[PDB]
Structures are given as C-alpha cells and as structure tokens.
Amino acid sequence: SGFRKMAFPSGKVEGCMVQVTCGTTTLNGLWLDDVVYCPRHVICTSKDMLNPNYEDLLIRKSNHNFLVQAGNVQLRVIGHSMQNCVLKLKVDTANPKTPKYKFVRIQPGQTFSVLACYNGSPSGVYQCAMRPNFTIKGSFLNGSCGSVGFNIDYDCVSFCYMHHMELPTGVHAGTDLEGNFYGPFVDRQTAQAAGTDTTITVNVLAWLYAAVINGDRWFLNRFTTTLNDFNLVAMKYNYEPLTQDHVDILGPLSAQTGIAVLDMCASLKELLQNGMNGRTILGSALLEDEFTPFDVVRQCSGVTFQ
Amino acid sequence: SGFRKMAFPSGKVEGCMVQVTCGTTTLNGLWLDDVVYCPRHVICTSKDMLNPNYEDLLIRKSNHNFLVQAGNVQLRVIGHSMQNCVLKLKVDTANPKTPKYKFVRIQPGQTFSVLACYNGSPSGVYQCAMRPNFTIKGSFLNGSCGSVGFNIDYDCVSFCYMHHMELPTGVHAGTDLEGNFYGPFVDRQTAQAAGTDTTITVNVLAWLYAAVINGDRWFLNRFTTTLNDFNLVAMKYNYEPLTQDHVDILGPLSAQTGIAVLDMCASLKELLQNGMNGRTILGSALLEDEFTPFDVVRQCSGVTFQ
C-alpha cells in the first residue's frame, strides 16, 4: 500500500535530450528520428525577447548556425524550420534511441511527468498537472527551456509539453510539440495574464478514493448530495464544475470502494465548507488535485510499462 | 524558479531491473554485471514467511527453481547464494547496460529516489526520505519487492535501498544492497515495532531556505535563538535535535539568502508554537522534511548528471 506523487520512468526520454545552441543561447532540444525540436526563442538574445519578429530573426540564420550536441556526438544540421513556436532542426542522422512516440495535446486537468534538463543533460523528474488556466507549477531555472513533459502508455512515449517561459508571476507556460502554446501565452517578454485558476474537482475526488483505499475514513459522512447542488458549492470555492463525464470516469473507483460518487461529493462538500480541522488526508493538510482518476487506478493496481 | 519533490533520472537504473520468480512468488531483481540481487524471501511461500529458516530453505532450492526474466530474454541462473537478507543469483551473461555503480548504506534523514517496479518492469519513480526510525513512507503494492532506491553522484549510481516488506502498520522496510536491513526489522511475517518517528529538523530548515529563495518569506521573524534553546522547543514537537554539524551543513543556504541559521531556527520555533494560520509555504500547509540541504542546492543551481 502507500500513496506517492509518482513520475513515469524517464529512461526513454533521457535518450532524446540534446543540447541546442544558437548564437549565445543554449537550451534543450528533443531528438526523434532525424529531427530536433526546441523552442524557437533559442534564436533570440536577451533584448530580442522584448518584442521578437521571429521570421526575420530566423532568416538571418543558416543550417550551420545551429550547434546541436547529443552527449558528445555532434549532429549535422541539414535543414531548419519554424512550426508555430517550435524550431524543427533537420539533422543528418536519426536518433538510434528514438522510442515509439506520439505528439499529444493534453487537456487542462490532465497530468504528465517533466524531465527537467540543463544543457541537454537530465537532472530530475517530477509529476505535475496542466492547470485549468493552462499553466503549470513546475521547477525550471535558467536554461531549463526545451525540457519536455510526457506520459508513457505501455511502450509509447506521449510527448505533450515543451517548456518555454516563466511568467512574471512565477508560474510556467509552454507549448505542445507542434508549437502551439497551452493557453493565451506568447513567447515574448511581457506581462501576461493567466486566468483565474480553479481546483480540478474530478482529481480531488479521485484522490479521496485513493485515501479510502489506503485506510482514511474520517471524511466519510452520513450525507449525500445532488450533482446540481454540489456544483453550487463548487462555484463558491473555485472548484471546476462536475459533469456526468467526470462521474463516469470515477466509476471504477466507485466500484472498488463501494462509495457512490455523489456520496463522495457530499463528503467533499463538507470539507470545503468546514475545512479539515487541522487533520490530514493521505498525509496532506490540503485537498490534492494533481492525481487524475487514471493516476489513482495505476498506483492502486500496479500498471507497468517495460 | 519553482520547487518540486524531484527524483533522479531513472534511465541507468531501468536497464538493471529484471523479474525474479520462485514458486508462486514474483518480485524484482537488480542485474549488475553477472549477478542478480533480490530479496531472499522470494524463496518462501506464504506459510514459510511466518518463521523462515532461510539456510534450510535455500539448500532445498536449485538453480532452475529461479526464473530470471529480463524483458523478453530469460537469463540462465548458474548460481545462488545468500548475503545477509539478499539473494545473489549468478547468471550466464553480464548485463550490457551495467552503469558505473556503488553500494552505499545511507543515514537516517538522507533522501533517495525509488524506482517502483512490478514483474521487473519500471512503473514509476519518486523521491523519498529514510525516516529517523529507519522506515520509508513509500508506495509499494504486491510484487513491488526488490524495487531499489538510489542516488546519482555525477556519473555513478549509488544504490542505497532494496525494498523487502510492508509492516503491518503500513510503512515500508528494506535493506542496503548488502542485505542488512535498515532499522530493527527482520524478513519474517510477524508484528514488528518501528521506533517513534521524529521530523528531520535539518531538512525542514533547508526547505524554509528553499522557500525564501523562491519568494515565500512571510514566516521570517525578527528574532533569534540559541542552539540549546531551540532544541528544547524541538523535543516538545518531536523534531530531531539540531547539532552544529547540521548548522554547518546549512552554511551555503545561509550565505546565499543572508539569513543566519539561528535566525531561521527562530522562524521555525515560532512556526511550531503557533502553526501556519492557514498560510502555505511553497504551496504546502505542513512543514516539509523530505528535502536535505543538498537536495535544495541541487534544484536551485541546476546540477545535471545525464
């Protein structure tokens, strides 16, 4: 038993991390088959970033202007291209360590693992969630740009995130691997409003199920509630409204614990309205919303990937 | 910026995980050079576990009684032997993916990464702390036994933990890679008393420093305190006593932030006596003790390993 915030094993992703250098700037790139993916702002200087015209900036660059190093192997750049906010550097040799992979645009409220990298070398891996406002609360220092987030689905690495910038408010923003930002953000050094963030209600309920599986009763109540009436309380505490799609997602957790979803909603309702009274759930003094229902079933059944 | 509970990249360790099966039991093994290391209790049945005579049990076993699976290739076991509580299965072929590695016995309060595994397949990775009572609060289901914990020190994998058992109270226990348990525990299915656990005071201070580095300084108070007077307060709240060794270890964080170690203890003293009053520190409503001072410096300077 036990419950932890678990990241996917990163081996398959480590093999794809390269160092990409253009002019003075060095960040991380993703080498799959014979293409390296990296944030296009690698072609910028500190002052360019205030208002870059990326097309003009890239025109002054040629293939040989790009220094791509994969460990100690020098890669040869035979093409360069801009797709939305990502740069696709065509290189002469395919990555032999290329895993089975696809590019995926995830939904707000889904989770993924991040392999934080500096100069193309992996330093850590951690789990996180794409917030409802399309930000992520991560750990990215100078030169972490181009680090990617991913899920593993059996043998297939699903790349969903590439890191581009820290907002003035300290949260993080980035693109899918086709270069479309999550949210309203742009790769330019200006103040940028993230939305009002909300708590991912379906995730919080999945975590309450994880609590019961592991021995925590105490929040279980004698009440129940209705879908319509729970969302009234949700709106007051800035929880995402619950839909029937969400209730269906919680079916298996419902069936294993024997606790109907609206009964768990009633327990959560009392928690929002009266707090936790300085007691904890699965060791936490707050309500946790960074486990999807799939994350909970994986950790409580032991799904492996090889 | 940002701060996360970050695990080491797991690639080098994934390459060493195999599946080891004996009778009905299947758990995980660590294939380094031509030896597979796994818990010796794989040679036990459910009923054997009540009181195993491991010497007699291992005498009755033959090489062919050990089915070692590495991906799709089954390895041929040409020897078996017991070193304390770990079983050493000599195999026909040396692991071509063997990293530079050492076997290390860690101290209570240090941290390490766990590659949680089932049937020899990596399923997840997370950071954890060896508690002062020599247990770990991990996430281990049936067949996770033999999962290992480790640190990376530049290029060398330092294996420090092998998982063996869940205590009846739900916490976890295991050995170093020489088969010596951490703590008073034994590999037999009986009630086993773990110690009184305490909070790792030096880790909490490291995290408070991590908080200041990242912009959370509401808890900074204007006072100081003495080492003797702080430990008096610490003992009342089941914190580990702080030593000068601990103060010296926090030196670099002290110098980077401009907050003397004893001033930070004064902040912590107040935090223990009046709680957090519904504020958070680095997103958390409780005081975190699973980051060592080295963990904080790694994540705040961006040290990589590849």
Author numbering:
A (entry chain B), B (entry chain A): 1 to 306
Provide the authors' original text about this structure.
SARS-CoV-2 Mpro is a cysteine protease that forms a dimer composed of two protomers. Each protomer comprises the chymotrypsin and 3C-like peptidase domains I and II (residues 10–99 and 100–182, respectively), with the active site consisting of a Cys145-His41 catalytic dyad located in the cleft between the two antiparallel-β-barrel domains. Mpro cleaves the polyproteins at 11 positions with a consensus cleavage sequence Leu Gln | (Ser, Ala, Gly) to release nsp’s, which are required to assemble the viral replication-transcription complex. In addition to the indispensable role in viral replication, SARS-CoV-2 Mpro also plays an essential role in escaping antiviral defense by cleaving host cell proteins.
Crystal structures of 11 Mpro mutants provided structural insight into their altered functionality. We employed crystallographic structural analysis together with a high fidelity FRET activity assay by our group to assess the functional and structural changes in Mpro mutants. The crystal structures of several variants revealed the changes in side chains orientations of residues in the active site comprising substrate binding pockets, especially S2 and S4, which might lead to altered amino acids preferences. Accordingly, changes in KM values for most of variants were observed, indicating alterations in a mode of substrate binding. We observe the highest level of conformational plasticity around the S2′ and S3′ binding pockets with N142 and S46 being the most flexible residues within the structures we solved. Also, we observed that the charge distribution in the active site changes quite dramatically even upon a single substitution especially around the S3′ and S2 binding pockets. This might explain why with most mutants we see the changes in binding affinities and not the kcat values.
